[PDB]
Structure formats: C-alpha cells, structure tokens
Design a protein around this motif. Structure first.
Motif, PDB file in Angstrom:
ATOM      1  N   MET A   1     -13.712   8.018   1.774  1.00  0.00           N
ATOM      2  CA  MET A   1     -14.581   6.740   1.167  1.00  0.00           C
ATOM      3  C   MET A   1     -14.017   5.628   1.863  1.00  0.00           C
ATOM      4  N   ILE A   2     -15.203   4.896   2.228  1.00  0.00           N
ATOM      5  CA  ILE A   2     -14.849   3.621   2.957  1.00  0.00           C
ATOM      6  C   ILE A   2     -15.765   2.499   2.119  1.00  0.00           C
ATOM      7  N   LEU A   3     -14.952   1.607   1.617  1.00  0.00           N
ATOM      8  CA  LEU A   3     -15.794   0.445   0.824  1.00  0.00           C
ATOM      9  C   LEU A   3     -15.810  -0.867   1.561  1.00  0.00           C
ATOM     10  N   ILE A   4     -16.849  -1.627   1.234  1.00  0.00           N
ATOM     11  CA  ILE A   4     -17.061  -3.003   1.685  1.00  0.00           C
ATOM     12  C   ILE A   4     -17.398  -3.767   0.410  1.00  0.00           C
ATOM     13  N   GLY A   5     -17.147  -5.169   0.469  1.00  0.00           N
ATOM     14  CA  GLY A   5     -17.417  -6.167  -0.319  1.00  0.00           C
ATOM     15  C   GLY A   5     -17.009  -7.664  -0.097  1.00  0.00           C
ATOM     16  N   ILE A   6     -17.513  -8.392  -0.598  1.00  0.00           N
ATOM     17  CA  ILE A   6     -17.196  -9.933  -0.473  1.00  0.00           C
ATOM     18  C   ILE A   6     -16.473 -10.343  -1.759  1.00  0.00           C
ATOM     19  N   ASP A   7     -15.285 -11.112  -1.468  1.00  0.00           N
ATOM     20  CA  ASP A   7     -14.626 -11.643  -2.397  1.00  0.00           C
ATOM     21  C   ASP A   7     -14.403 -13.202  -2.210  1.00  0.00           C
ATOM     22  N   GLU A   8     -14.527 -13.924  -3.154  1.00  0.00           N
ATOM     23  CA  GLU A   8     -14.115 -15.407  -3.187  1.00  0.00           C
ATOM     24  C   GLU A   8     -12.591 -15.544  -2.799  1.00  0.00           C
ATOM     25  N   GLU A   9     -12.257 -16.426  -2.083  1.00  0.00           N
ATOM     26  CA  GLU A   9     -10.978 -16.746  -1.585  1.00  0.00           C
ATOM     27  C   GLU A   9     -10.375 -15.885  -0.836  1.00  0.00           C
ATOM     28  N   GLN A  10     -10.975 -14.871  -0.453  1.00  0.00           N
ATOM     29  CA  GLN A  10     -10.517 -13.904   0.503  1.00  0.00           C
ATOM     30  C   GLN A  10     -11.519 -13.346   1.736  1.00  0.00           C
ATOM     31  N   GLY A  11     -12.861 -14.105   1.509  1.00  0.00           N
ATOM     32  CA  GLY A  11     -13.740 -13.548   2.573  1.00  0.00           C
ATOM     33  C   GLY A  11     -14.329 -11.922   2.187  1.00  0.00           C
ATOM     34  N   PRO A  12     -14.551 -11.418   3.389  1.00  0.00           N
ATOM     35  CA  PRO A  12     -15.192 -10.034   3.192  1.00  0.00           C
ATOM     36  C   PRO A  12     -13.732  -9.062   3.226  1.00  0.00           C
ATOM     37  N   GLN A  13     -14.163  -7.797   2.706  1.00  0.00           N
ATOM     38  CA  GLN A  13     -13.225  -6.993   2.815  1.00  0.00           C
ATOM     39  C   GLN A  13     -13.677  -5.470   3.384  1.00  0.00           C
ATOM     40  N   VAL A  14     -12.930  -4.639   4.079  1.00  0.00           N
ATOM     41  CA  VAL A  14     -13.246  -3.373   4.285  1.00  0.00           C
ATOM     42  C   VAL A  14     -12.041  -2.490   3.957  1.00  0.00           C
ATOM     43  N   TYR A  15     -12.211  -1.414   3.328  1.00  0.00           N
ATOM     44  CA  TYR A  15     -10.946  -0.556   2.394  1.00  0.00           C
ATOM     45  C   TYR A  15     -11.252   0.864   2.835  1.00  0.00           C
ATOM     46  N   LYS A  16     -10.362   1.755   3.019  1.00  0.00           N
ATOM     47  CA  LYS A  16     -10.403   3.036   3.031  1.00  0.00           C
ATOM     48  C   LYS A  16      -9.855   3.885   1.930  1.00  0.00           C
ATOM     49  N   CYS A  17     -10.073   4.626   1.574  1.00  0.00           N
ATOM     50  CA  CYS A  17      -9.439   5.529   0.370  1.00  0.00           C
ATOM     51  C   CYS A  17      -9.340   7.091   0.908  1.00  0.00           C
ATOM     52  N   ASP A  18      -8.264   7.525   0.703  1.00  0.00           N
ATOM     53  CA  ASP A  18      -8.088   8.832   1.136  1.00  0.00           C
ATOM     54  C   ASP A  18      -8.078   9.989   0.147  1.00  0.00           C
ATOM     55  N   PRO A  19      -8.537  11.167   0.506  1.00  0.00           N
ATOM     56  CA  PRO A  19      -8.586  12.415  -0.570  1.00  0.00           C
ATOM     57  C   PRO A  19      -7.132  12.485  -1.198  1.00  0.00           C
ATOM     58  N   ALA A  20      -5.976  11.902  -0.522  1.00  0.00           N
ATOM     59  CA  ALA A  20      -4.363  11.983  -1.137  1.00  0.00           C
ATOM     60  C   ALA A  20      -4.083  10.941  -1.972  1.00  0.00           C
ATOM     61  N   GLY A  21      -5.081   9.835  -2.243  1.00  0.00           N
ATOM     62  CA  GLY A  21      -4.842   8.656  -2.785  1.00  0.00           C
ATOM     63  C   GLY A  21      -4.149   7.748  -2.105  1.00  0.00           C
ATOM     64  N   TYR A  22      -4.197   7.729  -1.014  1.00  0.00           N
ATOM     65  CA  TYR A  22      -3.621   6.572  -0.016  1.00  0.00           C
ATOM     66  C   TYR A  22      -4.651   5.496   0.296  1.00  0.00           C
ATOM     67  N   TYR A  23      -4.600   4.738  -0.381  1.00  0.00           N
ATOM     68  CA  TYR A  23      -5.715   3.607   0.053  1.00  0.00           C
ATOM     69  C   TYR A  23      -5.024   2.743   1.067  1.00  0.00           C
ATOM     70  N   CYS A  24      -5.883   2.089   2.076  1.00  0.00           N
ATOM     71  CA  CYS A  24      -5.718   1.024   3.065  1.00  0.00           C
ATOM     72  C   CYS A  24      -6.665   0.266   3.116  1.00  0.00           C
ATOM     73  N   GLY A  25      -6.666  -0.591   3.983  1.00  0.00           N
ATOM     74  CA  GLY A  25      -7.732  -1.638   4.398  1.00  0.00           C
ATOM     75  C   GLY A  25      -7.597  -2.524   5.273  1.00  0.00           C
ATOM     76  N   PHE A  26      -8.603  -2.756   6.394  1.00  0.00           N
ATOM     77  CA  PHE A  26      -8.217  -3.309   7.671  1.00  0.00           C
ATOM     78  C   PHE A  26      -9.625  -3.683   8.146  1.00  0.00           C
ATOM     79  N   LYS A  27      -9.245  -4.167   9.308  1.00  0.00           N
ATOM     80  CA  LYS A  27     -10.391  -4.843  10.276  1.00  0.00           C
ATOM     81  C   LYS A  27     -11.544  -4.059  10.651  1.00  0.00           C
ATOM     82  N   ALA A  28     -11.190  -3.023  11.699  1.00  0.00           N
ATOM     83  CA  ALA A  28     -11.921  -2.130  12.172  1.00  0.00           C
ATOM     84  C   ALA A  28     -11.499  -0.822  11.813  1.00  0.00           C
ATOM     85  N   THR A  29     -12.646   0.047  11.017  1.00  0.00           N
ATOM     86  CA  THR A  29     -12.297   1.281  10.352  1.00  0.00           C
ATOM     87  C   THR A  29     -13.307   2.190  10.685  1.00  0.00           C
TER      88      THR A  29
END
Lengths: 230, 304, 240, 239, 54, 238
Positions: free
Chosen positions: D133-161
């Motif tokens: 699963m790849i997520l996106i969203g806008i947050d105040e004081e942080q701009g936009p976000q892009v995150y990745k969730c693993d089947p293992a439960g290892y989330y991370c999130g980064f620029k180009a995904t």
C-alpha cells in the motif's frame, strides 16, 4: 529436524527458537551505547538502502519518558510494538504512583512482557535486543535486554554487526571516568570502526541522557560534532 | 487504418500540383495520427511510405523551389515527432523511413548538381540523426558513405573530414555485413592521411586495411585495382624489409596486362626491391623464385 | 504440489494453492451466464436433469436475495445457500439501519469481505462457489457484478460461469448489448445457453431465466418462461 | 537451508523467516506497477490497468481508493487483501475522527496499518495479507507526504516511491532522475511520472490505461483525473 | 558502493560477459554500459533488499 | 492421498473426499423407498436385526403431526437431527401457531448441516433422510445427503442396492400419480421386493410403512396394519 516448537526441551541443549532469534538480532544493524559518569550516550547506525529515503520519518532513538532513552538492534516492526507497550506501562506506573518510573522497574516489566511472549506456543519471540538507559536519582543507568527475557547492566556495550569487534575496541578504548562529550567521541569512533565509509549527518542518529533529562540531538549538532571528530 | 490511409493518400495526392504546403500543414496531424495508429505488420507502414512519397512531392514543390530548408527542417521536425511517439522496436514497422530517406538521397543526388552547401548539409545533419539513431540501415549506410563523401568534397579533403572518416570507419562493419562498397570507402582515408601526411596514422589505418581480409571474389578485378592503393600504402615512404608483399603486389596488377612498359616497371620493381631488402633468408632464393620470367633476362640492368 | 495443505500458508513462489483448487472446483459445475441491457439484467443457467429422478422445479440455483437482487449461483449448492442466507442477512441489516434499498456495490463489498474472511484463516476452507449479482434502480440504472471464489468482486456487462466460460463469451461479446431492451435479451440468452452442449457429453438439460429491470418496476423474479415460450421455437431455428 | 520446510512463522537458522519473504512477492503475482512522486507542494500517483476484455467494465477496475477526503492510496498485489486493508484503513481513520476530533495525519494511519499487519504477523494461524500500500496526503506544517506500507509492517515514506513488479528498474530511473536539484512544478511531476512508467514498461500508450491520482496544496481534496486532462498531459509531454 | 556481494570469481564473469558484449560491437574499449549490462545479467537475482527487519 | 484426511483440505482435483466418504457411508444403510401420489405420500423402509432372537432396528420414526422421516446411515446423528427437527417444529408451532411448511424446514436442515461440513472439528453427518410432509400445496417427498444438497423428487430410494428400485420407479413414475393409498403402498413394496436378493422373501416383521395424508395424520405401522398391506401380491416372475 527438531525443536519445533516452543513447548518441549531439547535432549540436552537449549531453546533453539530463542537462539535463532538471538542470531537474527546479531544479524541486524549495529549500535553502541556507553554509560559515562554524568550521562549515557546512545548511537545507532541507520543506512538507507537508496538515495530516495527520508531521514525525518522513521526514528531509531526513541524516548520512553522525558529522561529515559532506548535504542535497539533488530526489527522496527516489533520494536514499535514493545515500545508502545512500554509507553502504556510507564504511564500506568505514573498513574499509580504519581512519580516518574525508575529504569529498573521498567526493565523488570518489559522483561516480563518479553518472557510472556517466550511462553508457549504459537507466538514467536521478538527479534529485538534493547539498550535501555535513564537518569534516575542522580546515578544514570544502562540496561541491555534480549529476546530470552534476560537483562544485564553495562558500562559500555554494542549490538549488531561486528559487536565482538566493537566490544574489543570498547574494552581497549573506554574506561570508567568520562564526560558526555568524550563518550560521544568514543561512541562515534567505535561505530565508525564498523560502519560503511560514508558516514554523514543522517547515517547516524544519536540521543543522549543528561541529568537534566533525556535529549535527542538534532542533525545540526550531530553534523557539527561528527564533522571529522578526530 | 487501411481504408483510413487509402482515402487520405488517394485523396491528398491531388493538391500538391497546385497549392502551397497548407495541405501539408493539414497532413502533419494526419500522418501523426496514422503513425500513432501504425498497424503492426505492413499496413500503415506502407501507407506512410505512400504519404511520405507524396511528402517528397511536396519536397519537389517547396524544397525544389527556393531551397529554403525551413520547410525541410519542419518536415524533419514532424518526422522527429513521428519517430518519437512511435517506438518502432523492429516490431516490423520501419519502411516509413526506407524509401522516404532513399528518395531524400535521390533528392540529394539532384541537389549535389542543383543545391548549394548549407541546405544539403542541413539535410545531412538531419539524416545523421535519422540513420545513426533509427535502426541503422544498409543502403543509407552506402548513402552515408556518399553523403559524408560529399562532406569530404566540400573543401575536398581535410583534417576535419579525416576526423569524420576516422569516426565513421569501424561502426558499421558490424551491423550490416558487406564486402565491396564499404571497402571502397575504407580505401578513401589513405589519401585523407596523405593530405595530412601522417605515415603512422597511415599505418593505423593500415591496421584498418588488413582487418578487411578475404578481399577476393567480390567482383572481377576490384582488388587487383585496389593493389594501386595497397602499394600507395608504403610506396615512397617504404622501408627495406617490410615491403615484400608490397613490392609483389606491384607485379600482379599488370599480370592481366600484356603490356611491355607498365608491366616492365612491374618486372623492374619486383626485381629492384631486392636492393632495398638487406641480407636475408628470403632474398638469395626469392631472386630465383621470381627468376623464370621470359621478359626478365632482356634487361642489361637485370644482368647487372 | 507441496505445501498445498493449509489456507494460511504461502508457497515458495508466493500463491495459495487452496484458493486455486477451490477456483477450479466451480469449473466442473453447470454453465451459468448473465448479461445486462439498458433497462435490466438477465440471468440464465444451463441446468441438467440427472437421469429421470428430478422434478423440474427443485433446487433452483436462481435464488432471490433482496426485493431487487438475486443470485445466479454455480458450484456447490449448499455453500451457495448459506452464502445467500448471509446476503439476505446483510440486506436485512441495511434495510433495518438505513430505511432504503441496499446499493449493489456496498452489498458486493460486504459479501466479498465475508468470502475473503473465509479464505484467510487456516481452520476453514475457501468457498466453492461463484455467483452473479444483478440489480436495478431508478437513480442508478442496471448493475451486474461478479464474485470469484477468492473474493475479487467487480463489474461486467456480461459474464459466464461454468465449463463454457470462454465458449459463451466468445459470442456474448458480439451482441449489440446497449441498444437492446431485455425482452430481446431473453431469447438472446436462450440462444446462447442453447448453443453450448446440446447432447455431447450429457443427455438432456433444462433452462431457467431470471429477470430484473425497469419492466418489473424494480422487482426481481423468474420470467414466466412458458409465456412467450421464447427458447424452443427459436432453439429449433438456431440449429441451422 | 530448509530443511524446516518453513510451514509456520518461526525463526529458521541463519537467521531469517521465510513466510514474510514469500509474502513480498504476493505483490509480484499481481502483475502491476505503481509510482508515487513528491517534488514540491503536490503529489502524484500513477498506475496502469490491465483490462483485456471488452465485456469487462472500466469504472470498477479502479485501484485508487479514496481513503478519506484528504488521503488517497493505491494498491497492488492480490485484490482481496488490498480491499480488506482499505476498509481497515477507512475504519481506523473514522475511529481517529471520532476519538480525537480532527482529521488524521497520514503518518499515524500508516503506523496503525503497519501495527495491524505486525499483529497479523506476530500471532500465527492467520495469513499475512500479501498486498502493498502506497499513501498520499497533505499535512499542514509539513506539506505533502508519500508513504509506503509493507506486508511485514515496515512503514517508510519518501520522495519518489514505487512498488509492484518492475520497481528495481523504477527506483533505478528515480535515482538517475531525482539527483538533479530542479524544482518540480507539478507538470514536471506529471511528466516525470508518465515518462518513468513509459521508460520502465516502454509502451507509450493511450490515455485510457493509466490512472492518475493527484493531491495539491491548492485543493487538499483527493482528486482523480479525467480522460480529457490525462490526454492533455500525455500530448503535453509528446514532443 | 552498490551492495553487490558477487564473490571474487564472478568479477571475471562481469569482465567476460561485458568485454565480450563489447565484442558483439568488436570494440576493445569499455563503456559504463558494460557495467549495467553486467549488473542486469549476473547476480541481480537476490537483490537487494530485503531492508525489512534489518 | 496424504491430502485425503480432513474436511478443510481442498483436493488438487477440487473434490473433497470426506464428502465422498460420507456418501459411501450412506450407501451402506438399509433400503428404503418413498413415493407420493397427488394426495398421499408413502415412505417404506426395510428392517434388519443383529441376530435371530433379537428385535429389528427401526427406521421410520415420528417427527410431528404432518412430518415423518425415513433414515439410513448413522443413528446418533439420526437422533441428533431428530431432536433438532422436533425442536424446530415445536419452535414454530409455539411462535407462529401453525404447522410448518416442509421446504423451510429442510432449508434449516441444510443450514444446520452446513457448519459441520466447512469448519474443522465436526464430521459430516452420515444421514439418509426421506421426508414426507404437508404444506398448503399437498404432499412433498424430499431427500437429503451428507453434502446437504437436498433434493425434491416425486419418488426416490436410498440405501443398499437401491438402484433396481430406481429402475422400477422409472418405469412406474408415470403410473404413480393417479392412484389411491393401497396400490401406491404395494408399488412401494414392489420396489422393496426388488431391493432384496431373489432367494428370500419379504416377511411381516422386517418391513415398515408410514403414511401421511392430506387429511390423515402421520402414522407408522408394524405387522398388524401391515398384514392387510402384504396380501394382494403375486410371486416374482421366476
């Protein structure tokens, strides 16, 4: 082909599923932690796989209270689980006694939790070794745990890849009496002994514990300090 | 589509004969959409061959008139786009380029007698891209030989065209196999290393000479005619002992000739390079391997 | 070939063989197709008599779940009966909690989650059913969905479930499906079912046709197929 | 190796477990490609569809699942795990909205989904939901976000995904592309997403196969593009 | 700096396949394209990753 | 064959063989025959004994004032579904104060027997139900199976060597629909006298007949209102 699973002992040896979890800990990312005279220094080794990852999202050094630091060497997905458990437990202690929990009582209860997961017979153990520290009642502490439920007390230690080599450097380099800055210096030395050649303001991630409280350092002062510290 | 190229080609051949290229402006998105369609095996490949032949009719109209080359570079701009949105993997669709650019070099043969230097070398700076980028052909490599030969004939051979030939020597000996015409290109840089006068670059391109073996069987007497260039290889700069194959290839060129003068210089230069070559094992018996010629003992200098 | 035992375990190449074996269980079942028109959804099931022991009107795979939704099941029948009861229960909760007719997307998603929940654990097996879901609404039009044994639930114009899954949709898709009302589509489905397997492996079959759309004013019921008798007088004209 | 035949979730010798690293290619049985990009105050999702049938619809093949009014996602891997994970995400976002009174940031949602997958991993006798699963969203004081969730439960999130089938190649292109320090003026983002998928898959196709989900700090609502403006971007990058 | 881990024979496999792929062009002169074609035709299988669990 | 132990396991040919084994366990019961007219439904079973001196194990058992079942296979599951059957009957007899239609009861039987056929920890029910009843629309003859795929018929027969019975039912199912009770019952035992090997004959003590009628309450008979039913026969065509 035995042991398999968690309910029965070996013919003579030990608990092979805990030994394998310890091996999975030893196969993890390195770390080092040093107890000095006034404070405790924790330091991990956090390499992104690509140049794409961000260094502001996932955090290795993590506070449990305002004066108790905690790092690991293993798997973040279990680390966060037992972190959340330790959070709720420490806040329950502070509900009961209206006083910030001492680190020995934390290590007792966290060890009880990990031990309860080592009990039979469907759940696997954690692949996580902790390094718990804090400054309770003047004298700071340092407590390492393990997946087997046990715990120890260190002056300086390491966990991860080449922990044996880093520990033999710690035995030679470290001593009894230092300050926090000299502790950070020898800590980045013994982490730089085993890490890759490119060590920057983001590949490491360092939090300290003064008697004035826990402090998680920023990339500004981390880059200021490790800008060729020796 | 097939009927969608049929109605377009068979009803837009007409307006070339009178009008300006406003119907070619009204064919640019039409050829773009037919190339985007571009059915797999032969269909819109041949339809675009037809419509780029009528584009060469528009090339008659506009690029035979004032030789502007802005109409040319606009047509190669829409070919650039037509080649960019359509991959042409060699999924059996390239022939929109084949007779198009072969009639472009047919135009360049009408142009080397008609046109001046700048728009023909703008056509060449376009087709350099087209052929060294678009799945390197066989005859537009021969037309590449003649077009970089026209860039040679611009100032008739210099260091710059020596760099052109030393960048285009060894690139297409390996993509399309060939034994005749690219050899007649590979002869041409020896005068491009003699009009700069570099004997060791003459020997580097002689390493490029003797990598083209099995010279024979190509045509009737192509390589016996090439022995002229093979002896110009080390004729007057020639040393004394590396020259036996050289000064024997002087001799088999008038082997066809029943002449008694130009074959007599072959006799005397296959017999007077012994006085070049110092005391050797090949010498004292090769002088009698070559002895046995009938016209040989009729020279007092041979008796000498 | 493994490692094929539990429904919780993965394979060395990463798929669950329990789900595949349950998917090709319905392949041996009877052929059941469906298609929608511009004002309704038509079902049709090739149903076979065993030899001479049936009653022509037993165990009808055309169920009737809600007032405007029914199933067109194929596979193991009792599992389909239980799943139909679960669907009736879900439509019951929605009617009891919100006061209007269930949208077919939400119903299909709840049913897909129920089927997926039976595919997840190791104590239970995946379902051996594959069924159709049709609907109609005055503000929504006609909707025809499709649920595999795994739990992947999305939408079609036409479908087929059974042996001749490809061999029905070879000539289903050459129907001018948009411009027809469903009263033509009745004999269309009749000819499609009648094309496949007249006498070859078995002896005799029998046709049922379900029917929902605007002409029923939002109701769902079986056709009076004897009324207009549209199969046989055209089935005998479909052999040539 | 095994040996132990890796049937349940235990620790093998030296030192890994094989169930999760078999679940990491349950994504690879999807046959699908996803790319996310964060350059600037926007964020772009792109993902193609593989519809061979004319009898099959086109609206209900959508993988972009609008989680909340400011949070989007895309799924790959097998479909049932993906949709069940999506309803868990919606339920837990609504639980956030009920308990805490305001809109959930995209970080806590990925943390909660990762924790659910870890609990599904920690206790045995349940399949570990093999979808990414790849997520996106806008947050105040942080701009936009892009995150990745693993089947293992290892989330991370980064620029180009990027995750799916061919994303070693996609991350190779995104290392060879996110190394130059230019800004990303939203059509730079759309152009680089379309062309990165167009160089990984090498198809250069109609506007009707890919799906584009965007979110921007001008309209923080999640937004799915239409065939007309997808065609507009595709011919806008057509030179 | 790539974590190739390609134990110390198969550097010559990279060398063989790469140089002889330049012998498909029959040049003796080496590109960086040899490194990409000898990093996508050698032990690019496992790879790269896993980057979970450390 | 190492996948062929439990209910949960799908086969690599998709046929769960525990269901097939339960079918084969049903195939080793006693023979029984049920068939209906337009107004009367009759099911006839066959008794057996453990020894000569002992009595015969009964098959036709009562359920309700208009419902009666035959049986074949296991007896613990038989009495289990009997108690569940009587329970669901008196449940609706309490609540709605009406007799039950048969179809919803047998749907409840299928939904009851669904759970031991899908989860782990119960066996499929070895059971041979032949159900006769009266709703508003006349007699019904249903049968079940351990796969819970219940059937409606007009005349079935399950148990050991019941196929010759089925051939008789084929060649008289057209004739069944018109007749009254007496020759209907003797068609039933002109199926049972072919469910037997030819060297012995059906006596009194081994046969059982249960009639339910549109005005007649369900009643079991044994030897004494069966001595009227056993006369009116000829010998087999030897």
């Amino acid at each position: 082909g035995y042991s398999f699973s968690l309910t029965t002992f070996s013919p003579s040896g030990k608990l092979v599923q805990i030994e394998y979890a310890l091996a999975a800990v030893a196969g993890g990312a390195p770390s080092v932690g040093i107890k000095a005279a006034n404070g405790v220094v924790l330091a991990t080794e956090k390499k992104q796989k690509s140049i794409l990852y961000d260094e502001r999202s996932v955090h290795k050094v993590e506070p449990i209270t305002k004066h108790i630091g905690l790092v690991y060497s293993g798997m973040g997905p279990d680390y966060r689980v037992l972190v959340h458990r330790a959070r709720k437990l420490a806040q329950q202690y502070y509900l009961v006694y209206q006083e910030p929990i001492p680190t020995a009582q934390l290590v007792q209860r966290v060890a009880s939790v990990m031990q309860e997961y080592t009990q039979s017979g469907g759940v696997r153990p954690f692949g996580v070794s902790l390094l718990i520290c804090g400054w309770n009642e003047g004298r700071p502490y340092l407590f390492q745990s393990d997946p087997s439920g046990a715990y120890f007390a260190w002056k300086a230690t390491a966990m991860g890849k080449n922990y044996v080599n880093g520990k033999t450097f710690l035995e030679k380099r470290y001593n009894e009496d230092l300050e926090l800055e000299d502790a950070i210096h020898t800590a980045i030395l013994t982490l730089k002994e085993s890490f890759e050649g490119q060590m920057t303001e983001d590949n490491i991630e360092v939090g300290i514990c003064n008697e004035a409280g826990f402090r998680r350092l920023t990339p500004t002062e981390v880059k200021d300090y490790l800008a060729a510290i020796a | 589509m097939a009927d969608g190229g049929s109605e377009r080609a068979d009803g837009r051949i007409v307006k070339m004969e009178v009008d300006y290229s406003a119907t070619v402006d009204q064919r640019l998105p039409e050829c773009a959409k037919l190339a985007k369609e571009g059915r797999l095996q032969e269909v819109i490949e041949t339809l675009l061959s037809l419509e780029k032949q009528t584009r060469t009719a528009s090339d008659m109209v506009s690029t035979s008139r004032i030789l502007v080359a802005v109409v040319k570079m606009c047509y190669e701009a829409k070919e650039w786009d037509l080649l960019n949105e359509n991959i042409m993997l060699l999924s059996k669709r390239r022939s929109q380029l084949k007779q198009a650019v072969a009639k472009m070099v047919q135009q360049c043969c009408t142009y080397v007698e008609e046109i001046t230097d700048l728009p023909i070398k703008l056509r060449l700076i376009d087709t350099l891209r087209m052929v060294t980028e678009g799945k390197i052909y066989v005859e537009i490599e021969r037309a590449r030989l003649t077009k970089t030969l026209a860039t040679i004939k611009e100032q008739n051979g210099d260091v710059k065209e020596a760099a052109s030939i030393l960048q285009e020597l060894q690139v297409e000996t390996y993509g399309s196999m060939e034994k005749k015409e690219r050899v007649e290109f590979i002869l041409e840089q020896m005068r491009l290393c003699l009009a700069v006068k570099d004997y060791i670059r003459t020997q580097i391109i002689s390493k490029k000479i003797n990598t083209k073996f099995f010279q024979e069987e190509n045509t009737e007497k192509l390589k016996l005619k090439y022995y002229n260039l093979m002896i110009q290889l080390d004729q007057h700069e020639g040393s004394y002992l590396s020259i036996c194959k050289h000064y024997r290839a002087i001799y088999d060129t008038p082997c066809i000739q029943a002449e008694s003068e130009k074959w007599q210089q072959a006799l005397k230069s296959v017999v007077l390079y012994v006085i070049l070559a110092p005391f050797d094992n090949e010498q004292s018996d090769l002088v009698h391997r070559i002895s046995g010629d009938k016209k040989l003992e009729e020279i007092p200098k041979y008796k000498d | 070939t493994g490692y094929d035992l539990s429904a919780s375990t993965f394979s060395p190449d990463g798929r669950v063989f329990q789900v595949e074996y349950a998917m090709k269980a319905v392949e041996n079942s009877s052929t059941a197709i469906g298609i929608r028109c511009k004002d309704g959804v038509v079902f049709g099931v090739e149903k076979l008599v065993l030899s001479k022991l049936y009653e022509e009107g037993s165990n009808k795979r055309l169920f009737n779940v809600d007032r405007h939704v029914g199933m067109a099941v194929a596979g193991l029948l009792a599992d389909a009966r239980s799943l139909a009861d679960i669907a009736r229960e879900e439509a019951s909760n929605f009617r009891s909690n919100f006061g209007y007719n269930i949208p077919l997307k939400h119903l299909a998603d709840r049913v897909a989650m129920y089927v997926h929940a039976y595919t997840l654990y190791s104590a239970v097996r995946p379902f051996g059913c594959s069924f159709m879901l049709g609907s109609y609404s005055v503000n929504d039009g006609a909707q025809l969905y499709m649920i595999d044994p795994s739990g992947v639930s999305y939408g079609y114009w036409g479908c087929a479930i059974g042996k001749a899954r490809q061999a029905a949709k070879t000539e289903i898709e050459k129907l001018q499906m948009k411009e027809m009302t469903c009263r033509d589509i009745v004999k269309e489905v009749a000819k499609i079912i009648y094309i496949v397997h007249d006498e070859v492996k078995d002896k005799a079959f029998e046709l049922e046709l379900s029917w929902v759309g605007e002409l029923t004013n939002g109701r769902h019921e079986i056709v009076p197929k004897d009324i207009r008798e549209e199969a046989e007088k055209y089935a005998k004209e479909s052999l040539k | 190796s095994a040996g132990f035949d890796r049937h349940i979730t235990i620790f093998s010798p030296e030192g890994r477990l094989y169930q999760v690293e078999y679940a990491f290619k349950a994504i690879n049985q999807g046959g699908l490609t996803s790319v996310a990009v964060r350059g600037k105050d926007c964020a772009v999702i792109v993902t193609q569809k593989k519809v061979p049938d004319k009898l099959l619809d086109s609206s209900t093949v959508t993988h972009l699942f609008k989680i909340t009014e400011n949070i989007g996602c895309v799924m790959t891997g097998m479909t049932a795990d993906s949709r069940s994970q999506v309803q868990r995400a919606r339920y837990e976002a609504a639980n956030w909205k009920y308990k805490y009174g305001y809109e959930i940031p995209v970080d806590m949602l990925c943390k909660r989904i990762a924790d659910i997958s870890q609990v599904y991993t920690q206790n045995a006798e349940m399949r570990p939901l093999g979808c990414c699963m790849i997520l996106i969203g806008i947050d105040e004081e942080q701009g936009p976000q892009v995150y990745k969730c693993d089947p293992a439960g290892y989330y991370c999130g980064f620029k180009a995904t990027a995750a799916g089938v061919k994303q070693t190649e996609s991350t190779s292109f995104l290392e060879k592309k996110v190394k130059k320090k230019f800004d990303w003026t939203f059509e730079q983002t759309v152009e680089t997403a379309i062309t990165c998928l167009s160089t990984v898959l090498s198809i250069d196709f109609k506007p009707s196969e890919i799906e584009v989900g965007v979110v921007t700090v001008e309209n923080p609502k999640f937004r799915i593009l239409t065939e007309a403006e997808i065609d507009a971007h595709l011919v806008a990058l057509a030179e | 700096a790539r974590p190739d881990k390609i134990s110390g024979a198969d550097i010559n496999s990279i060398c063989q396949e790469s140089g002889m792929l330049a012998v498909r062009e029959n040049r003796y002169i080496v590109l960086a394209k040899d490194f990409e074609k000898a990093y996508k035709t050698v032990i690019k299988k496992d790879e790269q990753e896993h980057e979970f669990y450390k | 064959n190492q996948y062929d132990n439990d209910v949960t396991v799908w086969s690599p040919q998709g046929r769960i063989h525990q269901i097939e084994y339960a079918m084969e366990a049903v195939k080793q019961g006693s023979a029984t025959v049920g068939l209906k007219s337009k107004t009367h439904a009759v099911l006839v079973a066959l008794k057996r004994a453990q020894s000569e001196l002992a009595a015969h194990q009964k098959k036709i058992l009562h359920v309700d004032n208009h419902i009666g079942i035959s049986i074949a296979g296991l007896t613990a599951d038989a009495r289990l579904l009997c108690n569940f059957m009587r329970q669901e009957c008196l449940d609706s007899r309490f609540v709605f104060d009406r007799p039950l239609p048969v179809s919803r009861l047998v749907s409840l039987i299928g939904s009851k027997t669904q759970i031991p056929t899908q989860r782990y920890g119960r066996r499929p029910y070895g059971v041979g139900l032949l159900i006769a009843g009266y709703d508003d629309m006349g007699p019904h003859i249903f049968q079940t199976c351990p796969s819970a795929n219940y059937f409606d018929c007009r005349a079935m027969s399950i148990g050991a060597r019941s196929q010759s019975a089925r051939t008789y039912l084929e060649r008289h199912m057209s004739e069944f629909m018109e007749c009254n009770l007496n020759e209907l019952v003797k068609h039933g035992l002109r199926a049972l006298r072919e469910t037997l090997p030819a060297e012995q004959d059906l006596t009194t003590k081994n046969v059982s007949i249960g009639i339910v009628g549109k005005d007649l309450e369900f009643t079991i008979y044994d030897d004494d209102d069966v001595s009227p039913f056993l006369e009116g026969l000829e010998e087999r065509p030897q």
